[PDB]
RNA sequence: CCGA
DNA sequence: TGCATCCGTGAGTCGGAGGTAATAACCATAACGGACGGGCCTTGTCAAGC
DNA sequence: GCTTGACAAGGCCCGTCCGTTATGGTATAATGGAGGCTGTCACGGATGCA
């Protein structure tokens, strides 16, 4: 469909649950991943609750349920009453996503360990102190009531907290540790009150203090305009990527080829289930505290591996690729798959000199030309009444015929062809030519277009591209043809 | 610095420092109105030139 | 000091607690047994009173409820102390199982769960120390966590014990027969099928990541060579032209037999039907329907004026 | 690598400069002289206009 | 000599077998195969010929209504195996010289999960060709661009034609002067028959030692009783050369000699490649890369800048959508080209939806919106 | 590792 | 408040070939689930008749 | 242009049946971890310290 703009924001827990939850006709939601299983080892089918589950993500085959009994195409829009898998086409595993319900709150590592670290800006604390509270190395005072030695957002060690327990002062003093304390500190921050206090504080303050007050006020003003809560920087629900974007394929030899995202999700689910088990049976607090810190380090490695602490490695001490590592670099999604792609209807060969051949003309080899212009030849072989379908046309094309060469000669007449030599340093590195069929295997280039390509005949190769549409052939002829590119653009 | 201080977070994220640009764009809640050559290539549309 | 080593932080946190003595272990085991029998009578009261035993207690049958809460608090503190004081034994055991697939902290936490089970299963009336029974349960929990986690496509525990038995049997039959190793005698000494042995050896393989480099550089990747399993655009266009030519051939014959053949194979509904349900689409029953589709196939099997479809023969 | 990184930065800083209108209707101007480093010229005025 | 290897693996649906009975293969495509389905030693193979016939037991049997009706009409019993034979790639003709087969019950032991392994060696004699690389010992590379007949090649005043013409402008810009010393000394040794041997840095024995050695040996070769056209004292390194087409001598004397030229591994047969439509990638659904997997050329970011510096918005749009990772656009474009109609308008590419799902899985509420008549609504890009 |  | 120390961020484009990881308990016992075999019904051909 | 009757074929469906799989357990005593960096360069913030 068409759209006008793209808007980015912070995801709430209800929104993350809205991406993952899908209801059934029986009245049951199916969106939560509860087990770290992927597929069964005996039969290579996904398990009924896990990272590849067919109730959450969809069927692995077209119009087929998991347990059987619905193998036909005729059941459309139905859900199996025995298994629970909707009988749909199997391409919904590119789109359908799930979620993981955490047993403890966790902080997003983008908002804590970034620069300028918006969590410590909004909390008005130092980054080392918030990083010490989150990873269970220090306490913090949530209720400073009835004390002169204690104040709000003050950090304490374990010794300082057990020596406060001498006085049992004689009132209710609360403390907190981990991301529960950070979530409770963010949940009680009145945004309009702190904003008007900062606006009443900037007009009467010093020089270097004023820049910090301006930075905190401009962070706080974003949370009122976006209508987003400050406690949404701590995660209660974790979204799970669709399973076809983290595929698990089998190689010829029996070994399975997996992606690195499955190990990180498996660690998150394993530590979550162990934390729920420890909280169920009332384990000692030194064991439950180490389990929450490990879950915190597990969620951070899934999002950005090696951002805060030790980098999680694999088999040969190679670091696992994470959700920000698949997008953040020159091998990521932007620079390798969106701004530049591999294309169909293309080829390459070495170039030779082309004297006794005009400008705007390239010498295109014949075996290269039957491959690049194959659907245009297939269309002409049916229009001329030689064959009747694509299979006879492909058979006569591959078997070799003298009719195919006359057909290709009358097909490539007037069809411009774009030539490219890497590196493409300026505009004249891609130019369009009218091909003539030469015999041999090299591409014949005209000697006058050679400084425009920076190309000599001692080993250079050039790529060839065929425009398909009629607007694309009219643009190669009127805008890119080599007999109109005499002057430099610089 | 002038490439990263543009009105479009898609171009600034595809250029350099993707994590920081996406974090400030998510906190500021900003929209990308698809005005430029680099966004329409990523979207898949005709470029506006 | 500030550090980012969580293992060092946890080792300092367990080094802050001292080690027990033996009479301490006897007294804590007595309090743990008291706690467990109190939880047993609590569990049978929940099984009798439909899970509303929070205000019910058989230890008394106002100050008595406070004494009961104090007793329960001291027994729970005794259990937590006996678990907490022995966390050094878990670190001393779990440092041997380091490179089998789990990290150090996962082995420590699973051995801690095993230590919890050993502290709730200890018998002080046997004279034995706590460390032997604790070592048994900690190694049990660590090996069960290895067999349950640390593999993407996980294998059951009996498969791991079968792999170990096969390793021992092959090494013993290689000590006996020094040359010419024989899978026939390997399957003989294990009393199993040779294709079952090949299945065990195939399931025992480890996966390889799609992000591993192929050469000694960063230019290549394993996922760059894996083809997506789908249908080509050539097959799509060939079956679409086959569908169009098929409909244009079928609409040349009589209109009744054309829709009979179309409802028979799902060329309009997307649902292949039986012979009787054509008899409920019409009202004439299914015996005329089979003769209709038979003579329609005989008319389409004519040598003249039907060879346009004969080129799709593969 | 230095040359190509400079080229990528220059492309990203000015990927949205398209000719949109025919005239802006301004009175501001740029003074052009012949570029000289010493007594001999480098670019003359006729080449610069 | 090329080497081809095929393994008869073990599949869950059944064992793969190497056989002579292959479906959808004609009569005379099996003449070179033996009784087991393998080629014999000394057979000539070209591109597409069967080396080892192999089948595997496919077992899904999910047929569309078109195939069901076509097998209702014309008989057409669908077999349980499919073709998986080893074939010669595009090009790579030659003679089969070694057909060694390894079987586990013959005494061999294999990679696990494979029944038998066949290894086939195919040898070919490659002549010199237009597009091949050629070089000397002085860094003077080049590509052959024309092969002329000897009646068209220039010839010497004894009537002997020239084997190779090199451009003289590649010498003083590249500053490799020793090739002219080498060709003149080799031509003196050709006219004498002595096969010289000269160690480098020979200017220790005097000033202009290489020049004096070369011209003195050329003079002594020209003092032969029949060969006095070899050296001219007016212009030393040059002699008169005649044109093969007209018979006229060239206006200026030309340096001739005997050079030692080399043929390099960069031949045009290993360089030519073309793709119409092949396999695709797993997640991105873009064409693969590489000659071995019939991959497509990468249209990188600099090529996108070059197309944007032109006009050419439609060339750039079809290069990014209907030629890569838009599957409905791929099918529609191929159908419109085959049926001769207009190619329709493309949709959202597949990698952009992958990026949207990845940014959502990072925890960012990113969505596309559409405004129409005072209304904002979130659009569904997955459709 | 090599080639442009 | 100025200077020293620290940390995160970047470092050109295409093509070919080869090619990865690599060591570590054992035992009873019940619950579970796919496979296999009769029962009934639904379905698909021969065959004679108006 | 249909109709009824014989002859089988084969999916659903509910029993056992045996191989797989999950779970619990073992009682001398054992009580803080191996394991690599150590030859890049330059710029910009952010601490941090005198
Ligand atoms: N690391 C490299 C090396 C080479 N090239 C490209 O390859 C060409 C190399 O030309 P080549 O023929 O190898 O050398 P010449 O410059 O022609 O010099 P010579 O004639 O002496 O070989 C360069 O222009 C350049 O565009 C490149 O992009 N990157
Ligand atoms: Mg060159
Ligand atoms: Mg050159
Ligand atoms: Zn089902």
Instruction: Please give, one letter per residue, the 3-state secondary structure of chain E.
Output: CEEEEEEEEEECCEECEECCCCCCCCCCCCCCECCCCEECCCCEECCCCEEECEEECCCCCCCCHHHHHHHHHCCCCCCCCEECCEECCCCCCEEEEECCEEEHHHCCCCCCCEEEEEEEEEECCCCCCCCCEEECCCCCEEECCCCCCCCCCCECCCCCECCCCCCCCHHHHHCCCHHHHHHHHHHHHHHHCCCCCCCCCHHHHCCCHHHHHHHHHHHHHHCCCCCCCCCCCCCCCEECCECCCCCCECCCCEECCCCCCEECCCCHHHCCEEECCCCECCCCCCECCCCCCCCCCEECHHHHHHHHHCCCHHHHHHHHCCCCCCHHHHHHHHHHHHCCCCCCCCCCCHHHHHHHHHHHHCCECCEEEEECCCCEEECCCCC
Kindly list the protein residues that place their beta carbon closer than 5 angstroms to ligand 2, a single-atom ion. A 456, 458, 460
Q: Is A337 on the interface with C (CB under 8 A)?
A: no
Q: Kindly determine whether residue C207 and residue A258, on different chains, have CB atoms separated by under 8 Å.
A: yes
| Distance from residue C156's CA to nucleotide H21's C1', rounded to whole Å | 7
Secondary structure class of A156 (helix, strand, coil): strand
Q: Which residues of A touch C108 (CB under 8 A)?
A: 290
Closest CA in chain E for residue C314:
E24
Give chain C's end-to-end CA distance (angstroms, integer). Answer: 76
| Phi, psi dihedrals of residue C136, rounded to the nearest 5° | -60, -50
Q: Kindly determine whether residue B18 and residue A114, on different chains, have CB atoms separated by under 8 Å.
A: no
Which 8-state DSSP code applies to residue A86? B
Which 8-state DSSP code applies to residue A467? -
Nucleotide with minimal C1' distance from the CA of C123 is: H27
CA of E254 relative to ligand 1 center, distance in Å: 30
Q: Which residues of B touch E304 (CB under 8 A)?
A: 41
CB-ligand 1 contact for A166 (6 Å cutoff) = no
Closest to A275 (Cα-Cα) out of A291, A294, A299: A291
Whether chains A and E touch (3+ CB pairs under 8 A) is answered by yes
Nearest CB partner across the interface for E273, out of A95, A347, A472: A347
Q: Kindly determine whether residue B41 and residue E364, on different chains, have CB atoms separated by under 8 Å.
A: no
> For residue A69, how far is the Cα from the chain centroid?
36
Which 8-state DSSP code applies to residue A483? G
Burial of B2 (0-12, 13-18, 19+ CB in 10 A): exposed
Q: Kindly determine whether residue C198 and residue E277, on different chains, have CB atoms separated by under 8 Å.
A: no
Q: Give dist(CA A433, CA A415) in Å, integer.
A: 9
Q: Give dist(CA C92, CA C112) in Å, integer.
A: 12
Q: Give dist(CA C85, CA A286) in Å, integer.
A: 11
Query: Where do the DSSP E strands lie in C121-249?
Result: 208-209
Q: Give dist(CA E12, CA E14) in Å, integer.
A: 5
Q: What is the b/e burial string over A143-172, where b = at least 16 CB atoms within 10 angstroms of the residue's CB?
A: eeeebeebeebbbbeeeeeeebeeeeeeee
> For residue E258, how far is the Cα from the chain centroid?
32
Which CA-bearing residue is nearest the C1' of G14? A422
Nucleotide with minimal C1' distance from the CA of C29 is: H27
**Which helix (H) or strand (E) is B37 found in, with range?**
helix B37-43
Shortest distance, CA A251 to any CA of chain C (angstroms):
9
CB-ligand 1 contact for A454 (6 Å cutoff) = yes
Q: What is the b/e burial string over A321-346, where b = at least 16 CB atoms within 10 angstroms of the residue's CB?
A: bbbbbbbbeeebbbbbbbbbbbbbbb
The answer to whether the peptide bond before residue A423 is cis (omega within 30 degrees of 0) is yes
Q: Give dist(CA E218, CA E258) in Å, integer.
A: 13
Q: Is C69 on the interface with E (CB under 8 A)?
A: no
Q: What is the b/e burial string over C156-193, where b = at least 16 CB atoms within 10 angstroms of the residue's CB?
A: eeebeebeeebeebbeebeeeeeeeeeeeebbeebeee
Interface of D with B in 18-37 (CB under 8 A): 18
Whether chains C and A touch (3+ CB pairs under 8 A) is answered by yes
CB-ligand 1 contact for A456 (6 Å cutoff) = yes
Nearest CB partner across the interface for E317, out of B22, B42, B46: B46
| Structure determination method | cryo-EM
Closest CA in chain D for residue B8:
D16
Tokens at E147, concatenated: 């092969």
Contact predicate C25/C124, CB 8 Å: yes
Q: Give dist(CA D9, CA B4) in Å, integer.
A: 11
The DSSP code sequence of A208-259 is HHHHHHHHHHHHHHHHHHTT--GGGGEEEEEEE--GGGS--EE-TTS-EEE-
Atom nearest to E170 CA in ligand 1: 20
Mutation target vs E (from A40, A343, A452; most E CBs, 10 A cutoff): A343
Q: Which residues of C touch E285 (CB under 8 A)?
A: 228
Shortest distance, CA B49 to any CA of chain D (angstroms):
7
Which 8-state DSSP code applies to residue C34? H
Compute the C-alpha angle A231/A234/A239, nearest 5°.
120
| Distance from residue C288's CA to nucleotide G49's C1', rounded to whole Å | 15
Q: Is E313 on the interface with B (CB under 8 A)?
A: yes
| Distance from residue A69's CA to nucleotide H15's C1', rounded to whole Å | 21
Compute the C-alpha angle E81/E84/E86, nearest 5°.
150
Contact predicate C146/C167, CB 8 Å: no
Shortest distance, CA E294 to any CA of chain B (angstroms):
25
Contact predicate E208/E240, CB 8 Å: no
Q: Is C231 on the interface with A (CB under 8 A)?
A: no
Torsion C83-C85-C90-C93 (CA) sign: negative
Interface of A with B in 310-369 (CB under 8 A): 324, 327-328, 332, 334-335, 338-339
Closest to C214 (Cα-Cα) out of A339, E295, E289: E289
Which CA-bearing residue is nearest the C1' of G19? C214
Q: State which nucleotides on strand H lie below 7 Å from a protein beta carbon.
A: 1-5, 12-13, 20-35, 45-48
Q: Is B35 on the interface with A (CB under 8 A)?
A: no
Q: Kindly determine whether residue C149 and residue A262, on different chains, have CB atoms separated by under 8 Å.
A: no
CB-ligand 1 contact for A425 (6 Å cutoff) = no
Q: Give dist(CA E174, CA E136) in Å, integer.
A: 13
Indicate the resolution in Å: 3.0
Number of other CB atoms surrounding residue C260 within 10 Å: 19
Number of other CB atoms surrounding residue A70 within 10 Å: 22
Residue B45: C-alpha distances to residues A37, A206, A489, B38, E370 (Å): 41, 51, 26, 10, 15
Which 8-state DSSP code applies to residue A79? B
Give chain B's end-to-end CA distance (angstroms, integer). Answer: 25
Can you list the alpha helix ranges (DSSP code H) found in C219-269?
Answer: 233-250, 255-265
The contacts of residue A447 (CB under 8 Å, 6+ apart) are A353, A354, A355
Contact predicate E357/A242, CB 8 Å: yes
Tokens at A126, concatenated: 């130092």
Closest to E132 (Cα-Cα) out of E147, E153, E148: E147
SS (H, E, C) C261-310: HHHHHCCCCCCCCCHHHHHHHCCCCHHHHHHHHHHHHHHHCCCCCCCCHH
| Distance from residue A133's CA to nucleotide H36's C1', rounded to whole Å | 30
Secondary structure class of A19 (helix, strand, coil): helix
Q: Which residues of C touch A138 (CB under 8 A)?
A: none
CA of A442 relative to ligand 1 center, distance in Å: 19
Q: Give dist(CA C78, CA C233) in Å, integer.
A: 71
The contacts of residue A444 (CB under 8 Å, 6+ apart) are A351, A352, A353, A354, A357, A362, A363, A438
């Amino acid at each position: 469909p068409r759209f006008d703009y793209v808007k980015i924001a912070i995801a709430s827990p209800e929104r993350i649950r809205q991406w993952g939850e899908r209801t059934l006709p029986n009245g049951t939601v199916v969106g939560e991943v509860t087990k770290p299983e992927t597929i069964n080892y005996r039969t290579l089918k996904p398990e009924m609750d896990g990272l590849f589950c067919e109730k959450i993500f969809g069927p692995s085959k077209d119009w087929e349920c998991w347990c059987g009994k619905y193998k036909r195409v005729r059941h459309r829009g139905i859900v199996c009453e025995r298994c629970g898998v909707e009988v749909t086409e199997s391409r919904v595993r590119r789109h359908r996503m799930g979620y993981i319900k955490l047993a403890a709150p966790v902080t997003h590592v983008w908002y804590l360990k970034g620069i300028p670290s918006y969590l410590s800006i909004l909390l008005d604390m130092a980054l080392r102190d918030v990083e010490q509270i989150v990873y269970f190395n220090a306490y913090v005072v949530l209720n400073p009531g009835n004390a002169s030695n204690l104040q709000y957002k003050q950090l304490l060690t374990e010794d300082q907290w057990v020596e406060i327990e001498d006085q049992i002062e004689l009132e209710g003093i609360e403390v907190g540790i981990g991301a529960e304390a950070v979530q409770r500190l963010l949940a009680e921050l009145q945004l309009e009150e702190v904003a008007e206090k900062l606006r009443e504080e900037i007009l009467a303050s010093k020089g270097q203090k004023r820049a910090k007050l301006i930075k905190r006020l401009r962070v706080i003003d974003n949370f009122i305009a976006t209508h987003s809560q400050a406690e949404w920087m701590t995660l209660d629900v974790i979204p799970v990527i669709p399973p076809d974007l983290r595929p698990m394929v089998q190689l010829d030899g029996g070994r399975f080829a997996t992606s690195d995202l499955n190990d990180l999700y498996r660690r998150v689910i394993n530590r979550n289930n162990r934390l729920a088990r420890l909280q169920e049976i009332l384990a000692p607090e030194i064991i439950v505290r180490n389990e929450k810190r490990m879950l915190q380090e597990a969620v951070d490695a899934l999002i950005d591996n090696g951002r805060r602490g030790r980098t999680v490695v694999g088999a040969n001490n190679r670091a696992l690729k994470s959700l920000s590592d698949i997008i953040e670099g020159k091998q990521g999604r932007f620079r390798q798959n969106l701004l530049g792609k591999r294309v169909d209807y293309s080829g390459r060969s070495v170039i030779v000199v082309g004297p006794n051949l005009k400008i705007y003309q390239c010498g295109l080899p014949r075996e290269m030309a039957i491959e690049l212009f194959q659907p245009f030849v297939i269309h002409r072989l049916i229009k001329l009444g030689i064959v009747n379908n694509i299979k006879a046309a492909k058979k006569l094309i591959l078997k070799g015929d003298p009719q195919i060469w006359s057909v290709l000669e009358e097909v490539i007449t007037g069809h411009p062809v774009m030539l490219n030599r890497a590196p493409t340093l300026h505009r004249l590195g891609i130019q369009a030519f009218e091909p003539i069929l030469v015999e041999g295997r090299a591409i014949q280039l005209h000697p006058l277009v050679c400084p425009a390509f920076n190309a000599d005949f001692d080993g250079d190769q050039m790529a060839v591209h065929v425009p398909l549409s009629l607007e694309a052939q009219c643009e190669a002829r009127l805008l890119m043809l080599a007999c109109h590119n005499v002057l430099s653009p610089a | 610095k002038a490439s990263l201080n543009t009105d479009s977070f898609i171009s600034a994220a595809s250029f350099q420092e993707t994590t920081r640009v996406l974090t400030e764009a998510a906190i500021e809640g900003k929209s990308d109105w698809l005005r430029g050559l680099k966004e329409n290539v990523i979207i898949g549309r005709l470029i506006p030139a | 000091p500030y550090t980012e080593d969580s293992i060092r932080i946890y080792l300092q946190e367990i080094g802050r607690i001292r080690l027990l003595r033996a009479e301490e272990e006897i007294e804590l085991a007595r309090q743990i047994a008291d706690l467990l029998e109190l939880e047993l009578i609590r569990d049978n009261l929940t099984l009798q009173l439909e899970r509303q035993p929070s205000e019910l207690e058989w230890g008394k049958q106002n100050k008595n409820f406070a004494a009961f809460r104090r007793r329960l608090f001291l027994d729970r503190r005794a259990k937590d102390k006996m678990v907490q004081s022995n966390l050094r034994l878990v670190v001393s055991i779990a440092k041997k199982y380091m490179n089998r697939g789990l990290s150090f902290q996962d082995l420590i936490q699973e051995g801690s769960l095993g230590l919890i089970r050993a502290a709730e299963k200890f018998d002080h009336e046997k004279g034995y120390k706590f460390s032997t029974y604790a070592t048994w349960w900690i190694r049990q929990a660590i090996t069960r966590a290895i067999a349950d986690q640390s593999r993407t496509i996980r294998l059951p525990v009996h498969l791991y014990e079968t792999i170990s038995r096969i390793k021992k049997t092959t090494k013993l039959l290689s000590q006996e027969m020094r040359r010419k190793p024989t899978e026939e005698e390997i399957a003989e000494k294990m009393e199993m099928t040779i294709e079952k042995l090949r299945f065990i050896a195939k399931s025992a393989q480890l996966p390889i990541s799609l992000e591993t480099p192929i050469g000694k550089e960063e230019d290549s990747r394993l996922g760059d060579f894996i083809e997506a399993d789908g249908e080509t655009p050539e097959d799509e266009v060939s079956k679409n032209l086959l569908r169009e030519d098929l409909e244009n051939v079928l609409d040349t014959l009589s209109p009744r037999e054309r829709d009979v053949l179309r409802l028979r194979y799902g060329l309009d509904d997307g649902r292949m039907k039986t012979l009787e349900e054509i008899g409920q689409i019409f009202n004439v029953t299914r015996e005329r329907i089979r003769q209709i589709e038979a003579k329609a196939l005989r008319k389409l099997r004519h040598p003249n004026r039907n060879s346009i479809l004969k080129e799709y023969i593969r | 690598a230095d040359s190509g990184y400079l080229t990528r930065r220059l492309v990203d800083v000015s990927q949205d400069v398209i000719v949109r209108e025919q005239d802006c209707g301004t009175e501001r101007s740029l003074r052009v002289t012949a570029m000289t480093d010493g007594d001999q010229v480098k670019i003359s005025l006729a080449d610069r206009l | 000599i090329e080497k081809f290897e095929i393994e008869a693996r073990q599949t869950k649906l059944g064992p793969e077998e190497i056989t002579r009975e292959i479906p959808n293969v004609g009569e005379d495509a099996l003449r070179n195969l033996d009784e087991h389905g393998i080629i014999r030693i000394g057979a000539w193979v070209e591109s597409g010929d069967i080396l080892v016939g192999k089948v595997t037991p496919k077992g899904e049997a999910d047929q569309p209504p078109e195939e069901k009706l076509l097998r209702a009409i014309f008989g057409e019993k669908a077999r349980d195996v499919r073709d998986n034979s080893l074939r010669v790639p595009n090009g790579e003709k030659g003679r089969v010289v070694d057909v060694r087969v390894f079987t586990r019950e013959k005494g061999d032991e294999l990679p696990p999960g494979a029944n038998m392994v066949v290894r086939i060696y195919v040898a070919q004699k490659r002549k010199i060709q237009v597009g091949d690389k050629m070089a000397g010992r002085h860094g003077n590379k080049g590509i052959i661009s024309r092969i002329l007949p000897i009646e068209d090649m220039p010839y010497l005043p004894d009537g002997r034609p020239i084997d190779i013409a090199l451009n003289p402008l590649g010498v003083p810009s590249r500053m490799n002067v020793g090739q002219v010393f080498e060709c003149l000394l080799g031509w003196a040794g050709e006219n004498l028959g002595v096969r010289f041997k000269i160690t480098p840095f020979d200017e220790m024995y005097g000033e202009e030692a290489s020049r004096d050695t070369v011209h003195g040996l050329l003079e002594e070769a020209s003092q032969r009783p029949n060969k006095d056209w070899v050296f001219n004292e007016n212009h030393p390194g040059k002699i008169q050369v005649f044109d093969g087409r007209t018979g006229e001598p060239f206006d200026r004397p030309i340096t001739v000699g005997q050079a030692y030229m080399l043929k390099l591994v960069h031949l045009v047969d290993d360089k030519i490649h073309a793709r119409s439509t092949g396999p695709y990638s797993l997640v991105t659904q873009q064409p693969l890369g590489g000659k071995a997997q019939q991959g497509g050329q990468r249209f990188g970011e600099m090529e996108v800048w070059a197309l944007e510096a032109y006009g050419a918005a439609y060339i750039l749009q079809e290069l990014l959508t209907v030629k890569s990772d838009d599957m409905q656009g791929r099918n529609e474009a191929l159908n419109a080209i085959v049926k001769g109609k207009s190619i329709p308008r493309p949709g959202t590419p597949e990698s952009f939806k992958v990026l949207m799902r990845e940014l959502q899985s990072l925890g960012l509420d990113i969505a596309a919106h559409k405004v129409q008549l005072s209304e904002d609504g979130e659009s569904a890009d997955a459709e």
